[PDB]
């Protein structure tokens, strides 16, 4: 199918810094894939990014009253919607499920790859550390980055490539805002 | 920055399909299901603590379709430029034999927001327990989508996520099976 498609995309964004201590509101009118019209709570009025929005901007900017009301959103819309459900978003907390296994077992005579697989934890923010005999493995570490599962949970994989010695005790340390004390799992020889 | 809540909506002509949904820091909170005319929550729990009148959304969607047509003309009918997906197939949690799990077909960076997705267990389509998410917004005004296929890691089975988007010449298959 090749018949042309035309897309309209409207985005109303509420950006919060320090809880609700500093809120920002934006309205992005988008055509196909370019933003043409945009209201910034920090500017007060509408701005036309591309000539496509020109008319709109100048027509709304003349209504000083309405143009005012939109500034209010930071309260009527943003700060309001914030509390309407911080109970199940800002304060969501799902504990990480950590597991440490190494790719290829047989290979404990030469180069190997240890894998720390953190799964299903919520607050995106997390931090993993690889300890070779209680000693930060500051390098030679490869991470998957943060991965969004799309179901309000994340997963991530941090792997350690090392030459396994029958004594060395490598530990994976996971720090995440859902546990009082750090999460650690060990693996050696 | 700390958080961002986005009321995101879109209308697509000629397909005459739109979408209204709230996004909190990347994940979907809820979205109005046009047809059923009712609002849908990503997590049951969310609903039990808040509400939204589906109708009011169906109202915007319509004024969007309008503004769209005006915005079409105003630009001498220049169509959207297809941007092909980028599919990856990961497993929800570490896959271990005979232990329940889920396959996630994660389609990213595309537009127009239109794409057919099929799960195939050993080249045959599967239509059960499968689940998808609506079209989630990106900062670059593209889309992201998710598909779910809960399975039972078997040594003898092989899965394929077939994705067909207009920006793709022929369908696309991401392959998965136990033991990389």
């Amino acid at each position: 199918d090749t018949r042309p498609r035309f897309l309209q995309q409207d985005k109303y964004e509420c950006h919060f810094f320090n809880g609700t201590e500093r809120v920002r509101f934006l309205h992005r009118d988008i055509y196909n894939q370019e933003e043409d019209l945009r209201f910034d709570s920090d500017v007060g009025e509408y701005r036309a990014v591309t000539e496509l929005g020109r008319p709109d901007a100048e027509y709304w900017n003349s209504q000083k009253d309405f143009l005012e009301d939109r500034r209010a959103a930071v309260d009527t819309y943003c700060r309001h919607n914030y509390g309407v459900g911080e109970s199940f978003t800002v304060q969501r907390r799902v504990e990480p499920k950590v597991t440490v296994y190494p790719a290829r077992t047989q290979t404990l005579q030469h180069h190997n790859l240890l894998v720390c697989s953190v799964n299903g934890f919520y607050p995106g923010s997390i931090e993993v550390r690889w300890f070779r005999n209680s000693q930060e493995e500051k390098a030679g570490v490869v991470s998957t980055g943060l991965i969004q599962n799309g179901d309000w949970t994340f997963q991530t994989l941090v792997m350690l490539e090392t030459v396994p010695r029958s004594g060395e005790v490598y530990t994976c340390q996971v720090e995440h805002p859902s546990v009082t004390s750090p999460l650690t799992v060990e693996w050696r020889a | 920055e700390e958080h961002v809540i986005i009321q995101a909506e879109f209308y697509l002509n000629p397909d005459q399909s739109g979408e209204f949904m709230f996004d909190f820091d990347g994940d979907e909170i809820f979205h109005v299901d046009m047809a059923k005319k009712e609002t849908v929550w990503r997590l049951e729990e969310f609903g039990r603590f808040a509400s939204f009148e589906a109708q009011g959304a169906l109202a915007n969607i319509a004024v969007d379709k309008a503004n769209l047509e005006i915005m079409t003309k105003r630009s001498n009918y220049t169509p959207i430029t297809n941007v092909p997906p980028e599919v990856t197939v990961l497993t929800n949690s570490p896959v271990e034999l005979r232990e329940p799990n889920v396959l996630i077909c994660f389609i990213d960076k595309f537009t127009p927001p239109v794409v057919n997705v099929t799960w195939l267990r050993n080249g045959k389509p599967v239509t059960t327990g499968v689940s998808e998410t609506v079209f989630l917004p990106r900062e670059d005004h593209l889309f992201r989508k998710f598909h779910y296929l809960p399975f039972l890691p078997s040594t003898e089975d092989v899965y394929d996520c077939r994705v067909e988007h207009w920006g793709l010449d022929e369908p696309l298959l991401k392959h998965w099976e136990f033991d990389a």
Partner: peptide, 14 residues
């Protein structure tokens, strides 16, 4: 909890 507010879309043909 409570109720969600959504900004409304307004169009202007010129």
């Amino acid at each position: 909890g409570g109720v969600y507010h959504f900004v409304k879309k307004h169009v202007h043909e010129s």
